């Protein structure tokens, strides 16, 4: 071989897109749950008195 392979060599810009959408979805659900906790803990802990 005339070149050196690296770990991020075989990712083919759709596999990148897939790990992007996967991590984005995972983080999005988690962060949505966090914002849900925020809003419930805001309207309930405060803002009922």
């Amino acid at each position: 071989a005339q070149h050196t392979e690296s770990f991020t060599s075989a990712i083919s810009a759709t596999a990148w897109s897939w790990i992007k959408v996967l991590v984005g979805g995972t983080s999005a659900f988690i962060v949505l749950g966090l914002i849900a906790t925020a809003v419930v803990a805001l309207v309930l802990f405060f803002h009922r008195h």
Partner: protein
Amino acid sequence: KLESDKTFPIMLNGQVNGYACVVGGRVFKPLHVEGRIDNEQLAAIKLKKASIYDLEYGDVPQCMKSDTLQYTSDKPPGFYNWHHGAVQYENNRFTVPRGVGGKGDSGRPILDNKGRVVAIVLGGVNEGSRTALSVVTWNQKGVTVKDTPEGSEPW
């Protein structure tokens, strides 16, 4: 005074440590207090948990739905009847005279003149010549809200 029957005590190691009260076809009981309600039909129901109000609440079964208290959030300041006596409501605070109530009086409904419950007592703090009650009430909009004067100690 006469409607106080529908609150029934809980038994913990054989002694009464609190009371469970039925309102709106829903039986309630403070979380902090442990035991089994002293009657059979209400002993059965799996009581769901509400930590943020310190209240276990359950759906009273069928055949005594019409045998329960009513409640409103309409609470003008003034004197309101309660098991041991009157409770004066003022400056958005329920307060009973000094020394009355204590350990074991948790879950005790506080009624108004017309028998409608205004709050369930969960604790207290003795301030000066009075003692203010930490209760669970319903606000002007009528959603449930725990009201705690600072330093309330559970009963």
